[PDB]
Design a protein around this ligand. Structure first.
Ligand code: HEM
Ligand SMILES: COc1ccc(C(=O)O)cc1
Ligand SMILES: [Cl-]
Length: 393
């Protein structure tokens, strides 16, 4: 009754062009079984949304990667937020919510915007740049480590650590094995920066540690919560901004609309998140037998959610394969949905908005002018290199 498919959603061929296989996954049925990894899969919007919004049945504390923490040791101590269920999830989540709050955004917005404008001005002096290394990576590197309160030395470990975290949600394929083999120096740096004396006053890290006296978290929970921001807070935005620039480079008509109304910047970024879905997948584990989309799934089963596929499901979206900066994007699952929905989404949206605003005001054209190279990761979708020529307005 449940169709069995041999598609490997973690293979390099799939990463290179996931869209045909994602349609096959959606059209085979609401629930599929992936024989390659012995997991259930849901690729339509309806079932992805339903799974995300039932955390009791589809839990996170047994891991949101392939590995079931009831069967295997986690590769690092579990995240106190991503890999926790309510009620243990609730108070750490509230702390991160307040650390990454509107008031925090108000304190950092002017500096984030100035850094975005400065980066675009700098890139316009060069003309021909790599929109990944020189923009999607360089801009978040110029604002987020400082906003965390990190020292200068050792920041080169941040992107390798995040690549490792996101590869480690995947199955035990070569991408995951190689990441773990190389992990020790990045893990050592990241864990050390999580300690209170190593986080500069006023930054996100110090603010987490300051919350350790309200009864929401204890001092021994603060380092792992800093670790969450150092895991998820940089490489996601690199791939979100890279997605937006890649969309604007491919769809010049949308760049022209954005130039004509720079207040569309925030929605242009949100649409890029839906369109590319830089965070492609997460798993849940069933805590009981459950009926989902007419199919019966037993207890203790891994369920793979295709967030990118849900964001392109024609059952939910009109013209899902078109990039449309005025689309009503509310309800997309690129940041998740429900109790675990991205706690950092205000930081991500701030960065994406101010960068797209800078481009909207300063750049007349974005033309791909070199070979495009894709980056392969078990969870992240994005480019390694995006050579573009920027023409000034
Ligand atoms: C475009 C950028 C980003 C995307 C696409 C993204 C995506 C996601 C998704 C899909 C989830 C849901 C996880 C789940 O349901 O299991 C999530 C959660 C999370 N994100 Fe984001 N994220 C982004 C940026 C950020 C930033 C900038 C931060 C921190 C500064 C951050 C920190 C977190 C944390 C800590 C969680 C776990 C929340 C929880 O479990 O309650 N993310 N993110
Ligand atoms: C969205 O991806 C992540 C990755 C890691 C963490 C974490 O370490 O808590 C949270 C979200
Ligand atoms: Cl670690």
């Amino acid at each position: 009754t449940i169709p069995h498919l041999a598609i490997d959603p973690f293979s390099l061929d799939f990463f290179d062009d996931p869209y045909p296989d994602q349609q096959t996954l959606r059209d085979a049925g609401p629930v599929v079984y992936l024989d390659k990894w012995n997991v259930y899969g849901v690729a339509r919007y309806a079932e992805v949304h339903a799974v995300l919004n039932d955390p009791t049945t589809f839990c996170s504390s047994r891991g949101v990667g392939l590995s079931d923490f009831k069967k295997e040791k986690p590769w690092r101590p579990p995240s106190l937020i991503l890999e926790a269920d309510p009620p243990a999830h609730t108070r750490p989540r509230a702390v991160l919510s307040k650390v990454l709050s509107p008031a925090t955004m108000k304190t950092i917005r002017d500096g984030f915007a100035a850094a975005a404008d400065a980066k675009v001005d700098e890139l316009l002096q060069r003309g021909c740049i790599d929109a990944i290394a020189d923009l999607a990576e360089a801009y978040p590197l110029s604002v987020f480590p400082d906003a965390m309160g990190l020292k200068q030395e050792g920041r080169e470990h941040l992107l390798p650590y995040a690549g490792l975290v996101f590869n480690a949600f995947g199955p035990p394929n070569e991408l995951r094995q190689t990441a773990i083999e190389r992990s020790a120096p990045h893990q050592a740096y990241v864990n050390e920066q999580c300690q209170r004396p190593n986080l500069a006053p006023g930054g996100f890290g110090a603010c987490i540690h300051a919350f350790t006296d309200t009864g929401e978290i204890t001092p021994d929970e603060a380092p792992l919560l800093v670790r969450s921001l150092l895991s998820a807070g940089l490489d996601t935005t690199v791939n979100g901004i890279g997605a937006a620039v890649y969309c604007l480079a491919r769809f010049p008509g949308e760049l022209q609309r954005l130039r004509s109304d720079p207040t569309l910047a925030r929605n242009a970024f949100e649409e890029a998140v839906r369109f590319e879905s830089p965070v492609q997948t997460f798993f849940r584990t069933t805590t009981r037998e459950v009926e989902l989309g007419g199919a019966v799934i037993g207890e203790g089963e891994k369920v793979l959610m295709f967030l990118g596929s849900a964001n392109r499901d024609p059952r939910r979206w009109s013209d899902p394969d078109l990039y449309d900066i005025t689309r009503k994007t509310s309800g997309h699952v690129g940041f998740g949905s429900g109790v675990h929905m991205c706690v950092g989404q205000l930081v991500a949206r701030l960065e994406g908005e101010v960068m797209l605003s800078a481009l909207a005001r300063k750049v007349a054209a974005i033309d791909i002018d070199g070979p495009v190279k894709r980056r392969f990761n078990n969870t992240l979708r994005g480019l390694e290199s995006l050579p573009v020529k920027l023409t000034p307005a």
